[PDB]
Design a protein around this nucleic acid. Sequence first.
RNA 1: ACAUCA
Length: 89
Amino acid sequence: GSHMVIRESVSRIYVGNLPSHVSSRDVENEFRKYGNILKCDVKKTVSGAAFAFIEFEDARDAADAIKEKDGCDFEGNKLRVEVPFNARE
RNA sequence: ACAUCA
């Protein structure tokens, strides 16, 4: 998970407070340019917000997406992007 | 802040 892992594990993206509702296949069609995706899925909370999760074959190539998609927002607009599974930092 | 099950 966190800290200097030294190879192994698999990197992912998390997006939350997402616009309307995404299909996992539609966001795969965008993320695939940063590297091959192994799995993706979508979720929701009883608070009414929605989430999506997108796996990647290498962390540092996918990080160019995570850093341009950065800056979460609230209390007037819905969008959030974060990487808890920040492998090879 | 939050999931993976393929």
